Design a protein around this nucleic acid. Structure first.
Lengths: 33, 173
RNA sequence: UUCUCCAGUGAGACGAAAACCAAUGCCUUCACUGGCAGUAACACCCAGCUUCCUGAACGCAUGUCAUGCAUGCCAGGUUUUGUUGGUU
């Protein structure tokens, strides 16, 4: 169960440090644009 | 990476203990920095293994916290923004106005989850003596034992995250 | 044809994108108020039984009712709309 949380944490940390951030950069452009 | 060990003693022969400890399972020592040992003592960081390092060692002569960071004890445990959680409460057996003002209170007051229970009192009181009195082995609200203790969450933090969240929502579109 | 509550998909004790509807989550207000930022599941008592360019410590950040003493440190090289059911 501890191993299964460790993979939950991991797989969704890498959704934050990729998929969230790069999208945020795009959307944060439109405010100034 | 491995184990930042803090406690004996003061007062230590930290260096002597570390030198002896080399040998497996353990390797890489040195006595450092704020308090009083780091030994690596691989590999999951903090570490899983370190539980053992409690009674193992002393001799000598107390001992032990370990951490990987942050690691003043003050932020995570002691205080922090004087957040509380109130437990048990139940969503269809309460109203938002009911538990709110009965516990000071609050604001901000957001019950979870449903599960059920574990409802942030984002509080003000500040929180010091409030825990001691509403935990109590009582007083019974609404019929359950009522256990109230500390967080270790919030305040302005969540508010800042709401601000960046708000501009992201308006921007997307 | 048990009694304890708050408005009926009620609970507690005891005996590869996106949006329309209802429920339900999370965020926000005060208020189901406005709305998808967040993200295994759960109606307590067991919260997990080398190409090309951007860039550089045992503590920072995520997370803290945690034996979470747990993860995180490279961009290039029929799903989505928060979630399930219904509709388009």
């Amino acid at each position: 169960a501890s191993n299964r949380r460790a993979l939950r944490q991991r797989d969704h940390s890498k959704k934050h440090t990729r998929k969230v951030h790069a999208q945020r950069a795009e959307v944060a452009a439109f405010q100034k644009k | 990476n491995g184990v930042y060990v803090k406690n004996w003693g003061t007062g230590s022969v930290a260096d002597a203990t570390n030198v002896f400890s080399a040998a497996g399972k353990v390797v890489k020592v040195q006595l450092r920095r704020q308090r009083y040992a780091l030994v690596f003592f691989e590999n999951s960081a903090a570490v899983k293994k370190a539980i053992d390092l409690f009674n193992e060692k002393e001799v000598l002569g107390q001992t032990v916290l370990v951490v990987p960071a942050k690691a003043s004890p003050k932020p995570d445990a002691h205080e922090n923004s004087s957040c509380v959680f109130v437990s048990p409460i139940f969503r269809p057996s309460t109203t938002k106005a009911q538990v709110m003002e009965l516990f000071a209170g609050v604001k901000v007051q957001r019950l979870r989850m449903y599960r059920q229970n574990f409802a942030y009192a984002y509080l003000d009181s500040p929180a010091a003596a409030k825990k001691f009195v509403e935990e109590k082995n009582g007083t019974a609200f609404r019929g359950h034992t009522l256990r109230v203790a500390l967080s270790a969450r919030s305040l302005e933090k969540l508010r800042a995250r709401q601000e960046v969240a708000n501009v992201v929502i308006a921007a997307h579109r």
